[PDB]
Amino acid sequence: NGLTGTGVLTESNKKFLPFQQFGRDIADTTDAVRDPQTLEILDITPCSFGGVSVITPGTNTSNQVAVLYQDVNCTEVTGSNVFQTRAGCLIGAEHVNNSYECDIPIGAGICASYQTQS
Amino acid sequence: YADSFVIRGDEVRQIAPGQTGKIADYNYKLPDDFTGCVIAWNSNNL
Amino acid sequence: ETKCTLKSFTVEKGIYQTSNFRVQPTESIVRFPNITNLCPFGEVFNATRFASVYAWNRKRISNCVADYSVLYNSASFSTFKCYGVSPTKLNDLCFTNVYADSFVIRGDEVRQIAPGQTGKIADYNYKLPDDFTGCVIAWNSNNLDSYNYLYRPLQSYGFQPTNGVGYQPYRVVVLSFELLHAPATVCGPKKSTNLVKNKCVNFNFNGLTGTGVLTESNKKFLPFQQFGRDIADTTDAVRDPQTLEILDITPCSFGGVSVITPGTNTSNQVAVLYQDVNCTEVSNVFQTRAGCLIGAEHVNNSYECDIPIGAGICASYQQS
Amino acid sequence: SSTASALGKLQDVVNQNAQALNTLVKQLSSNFGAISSVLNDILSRLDPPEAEVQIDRLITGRLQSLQTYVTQQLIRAAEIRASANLAATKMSECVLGQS
Amino acid sequence: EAEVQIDRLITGRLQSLQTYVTQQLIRAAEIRASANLAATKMSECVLGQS
Amino acid sequence: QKFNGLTVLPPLLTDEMIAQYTSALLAGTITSGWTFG
Amino acid sequence: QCVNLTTRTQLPPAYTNSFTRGVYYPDKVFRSSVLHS
Amino acid sequence: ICGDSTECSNLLLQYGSFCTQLNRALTGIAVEQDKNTQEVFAQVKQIYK
Amino acid sequence: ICGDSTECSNLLLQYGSFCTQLNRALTGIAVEQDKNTQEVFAQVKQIYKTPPIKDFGGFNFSQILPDPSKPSKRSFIEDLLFNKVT
Amino acid sequence: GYFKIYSKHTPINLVRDLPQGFSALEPLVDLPIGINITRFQTLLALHRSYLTPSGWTAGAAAYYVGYLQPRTFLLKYNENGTITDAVDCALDPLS
């Protein structure tokens, strides 16, 4: 009905009272809407975003890169052995079982480094 | 201060603050701020 | 100045930064390329046969820097009348195209051309709109004209050698311009002056309006580039558009001034420090790393610092 | 003399001050919503009624860039004063004494 | 006419973001003072006797 | 919490690693006195 | 004039891959040893 | 400020690098919080049992 | 913000004393920079000198003591430090 | 409402295709036209054949065509003035 916007729509287990037309929580943005035809109630949560970080060993040493997609479960993003962690997920880095002193801090306990050999 | 003169009906828009033209630039210049009023009426009879 | 700055009638000892100092520029200059074109205007006024209004031709003039004062400040053309924009302001502006009409009317029907009154020559031969057609130019002529030019119902004109005034055989040339919509093409003559060097001048190098001193540079551009730029986007070097010469631009000196008071329960004497500037360009005069100091004598002792100047130099009221 | 960037604490103070002074000058080429970022060209191309509206957009944008710079130098100088109060205590208690 | 209305939202929101970031710099200099005292209290009181 | 532009980054030492640091500090001040510092 | 000609052949327009080509000077300004974006 | 709206995002470019400066300030106080913990707790060479 | 423009400088007076404050704040933290260096380095009353014969028990301080044939009379290690900070 | 042409002439020694270096295409002209352009072609200079058994078609020729697009390209200027190394931003994550 003119309430334009962007997001994904899912079926809402929350309820309305039959005089209510949409909903909101905080800061004027709408969370739920009753559609004009079916009169079904649908949730509006926005389709995922994040930040992108890039891990490099230094161009003087090599020209290779891993990429961190911050705070996103990457079933929704290359292809070189992806690895989901707490700080996002890494693409282009090889998860190992050893342990060393920290070189490049990824976050939440994970570090990254370049050694022999990707 | 009441200031009176006769002007063409085309140029009743020329008497305004911040205006340029022929009469506003060469005959009578209101200043930029001008706290005041501008009163006008027709004189085709005279 | 210091008392006024502190809004007090008594100042204590110290050094107070009270105003600024700048060299004001003199004798502004402008430097523009060259005027190579002359403009096609040889083909409108010195042509032999001019038509009449029954066959009003048009001549498009484009891509020149023409002139507009060698037909206005000179006066032998009997008709130079046009409206709105005065012909002194066509050299500083320009549209997209210039068009030239030509017809020869006696003088009794020349007077009907003043837009707001369409003529018998202008209702059925040459369409005159409600806007003013740019300029109408005519001059008396008896060389190749002073008959066989008609217009409009269809009638001929009477031309002879013994015809009283009002019937003269003028030469009406009409000038009009294009919507100048797209990029223009035809401006007047641009303007230049004589450049100076090594003094604070107010310059204009084909568009760059700033102030500074112009010294000769030993740098090298590429043959298509016009000016240079430093880091953080400041123009340092320009090219002289007549002489193809690279000139540096450094800002003519500024700074702050500061006064050295021993306090007004002690004296009314003052030294002044002009920060980071050579006394060469506006008691004794003493040059320091902090800018030169005027009104204080440079002793050759060493005491403790009392009022700091900078870079190791101090001062205090000793009767000077 | 072989290993550079052992003075990395002292290089970061010089680099951060130059970064903030470089960003003060590059904000002079911003429009802030006016028609031109050079104050002489809205002068030579507009009348003083309309030129007053455009200059007041450049003044408000350039005054905000100068207040942001002074505020970030007031916070940054409070961190240097903490480090110089520590070097004055380390010179008393460790050069002129034994701790 | 949308541009003269959007610009009113931009200058108000850019000012609400600067007031946030300025007050987070002042608050984070109070934590660094208190995380420097906690480091001295571990050197001089856990690792030694004071 | 993430709403709109807002993010919270995770700290580099987890709470398990910080507890392992304070257990190695407490196992040296019991065993060795002040000699381990 | 206007002597048409073309035949029909053409096959698939052979493709290729220019590596780093086509960087024109987008200005007149003269910069000296300073990376510009 | 804008929030996925390219009419706003072009008007924001007339304000210079305000956003850039704002991102550079909040990253410098996120890296600092990780150094604050490294100085208090990592005061030991080995892990003693 | 104005840069030699009289009709700009006239509009700036409508804002009052925004620029008396900014010059006062930047001058307060320039005086503070001189109090910082004075409190670290001026911890000594007299300018002491080392004796010309140096019998320090076997200890050698020649790289940290100054050098009398040198610019600024810096020490050896004091010149490695000054040739590394841009 | 303008029309800008940029050019270069470069010696080469590769077999067929494009080389690897950098080319600073400096501008030739700029034409104050205002024409609305959306399709183009190229002119060949064919000569008459004569007493050799239509009668046209000189030589053998080929050219490479590829269409702009906007991105961001950074130029690492020389001390002379010359663009030497060009940086592409949207190429890869490293760029």
Ligand SMILES: *[C@@H]1O[C@H](CO)[C@@H](O[C@@H]2O[C@H](CO)[C@@H](O)[C@H](O)[C@H]2NC(C)=O)[C@H](O)[C@H]1NC(C)=O
């Ligand atoms: C004190 O130490 C300095 C090192 O800085 C010694 O000076 C060096 O001595 C060697 C001889 O073994 C020379 O080859 C070097 O050229 C000296 N370096 C200088 C003079 O800068 C010095 O000999 C030591 N003094 C004493 C008394 O042992």
Ligand SMILES: *[C@@H]1O[C@H](CO)[C@@H](O[C@@H]2O[C@H](CO)[C@@H](O)[C@H](O)[C@H]2NC(C)=O)[C@H](O)[C@H]1NC(C)=O
């Ligand atoms: C420039 O000319 C082209 C015509 O080739 C115009 O582009 C579109 O052309 C198609 C035919 O291929 C028409 O169906 C469209 O209606 C045209 N577009 C529009 C917006 O009308 C193009 O419009 C012309 N440009 C200008 C400024 O007139």
Ligand SMILES: *[C@@H]1O[C@H](CO)[C@@H](O)[C@H](O)[C@H]1NC(C)=O
């Ligand atoms: C609108 O039409 C749809 C199907 O076309 C159906 O839900 C119903 O007939 C109508 N819904 C209303 C009026 O709410």
Ligand SMILES: *[C@@H]1O[C@H](CO)[C@@H](O)[C@H](O)[C@H]1NC(C)=O
């Ligand atoms: C590359 O890095 C090493 C150490 O990381 C450094 O010593 C060296 O100067 C750098 N440059 C070259 C060209 O090897």
Ligand SMILES: *[C@@H]1O[C@H](CO)[C@@H](O)[C@H](O)[C@H]1NC(C)=O
């Ligand atoms: C990530 O997604 C998978 C399937 O898409 C799901 O099983 C898993 O729980 C998700 N992880 C988190 C932390 O939500």
Ligand SMILES: *[C@@H]1O[C@H](CO)[C@@H](O)[C@H](O)[C@H]1NC(C)=O
């Ligand atoms: C690494 O550890 C995981 C979990 O114990 C195991 O599944 C995997 O096989 C190990 N990798 C290697 C190379 O041993």
Ligand SMILES: *[C@@H]1O[C@H](CO)[C@@H](O)[C@H](O)[C@H]1NC(C)=O
């Ligand atoms: C040609 O016409 C121009 C009008 O611009 C005039 O000044 C000039 O004297 C004419 N030439 C001659 C030879 O009369």
Ligand SMILES: *[C@@H]1O[C@H](CO)[C@@H](O)[C@H](O)[C@H]1NC(C)=O
């Ligand atoms: C410009 O004209 C002057 C004559 O006044 C001449 O000396 C100079 O060489 C000309 N320069 C160019 C670039 O045409």
Ligand SMILES: *[C@@H]1O[C@H](CO)[C@@H](O)[C@H](O)[C@H]1NC(C)=O
């Ligand atoms: C300085 O001024 C005070 C009063 O303002 C006065 O008592 C004092 O004597 C003055 N100093 C000297 C040296 O006279």
Ligand SMILES: *[C@@H]1O[C@H](CO)[C@@H](O)[C@H](O)[C@H]1NC(C)=O
């Ligand atoms: C100051 O300027 C004068 C004027 O040319 C010059 O002679 C003098 O050498 C300058 N002094 C310094 C220290 O640069």
Ligand SMILES: *[C@@H]1O[C@H](CO)[C@@H](O)[C@H](O)[C@H]1NC(C)=O
């Ligand atoms: C102070 O130094 C200068 C050095 O140029 C010297 O000429 C002067 O004589 C000295 N003062 C006295 C009082 O000797």
Ligand SMILES: *[C@@H]1O[C@H](CO)[C@@H](O)[C@H](O)[C@H]1NC(C)=O
């Ligand atoms: C060849 O050109 C002629 C016009 O000269 C045209 O009538 C004919 O259809 C064209 N045929 C082909 C295959 O192009």
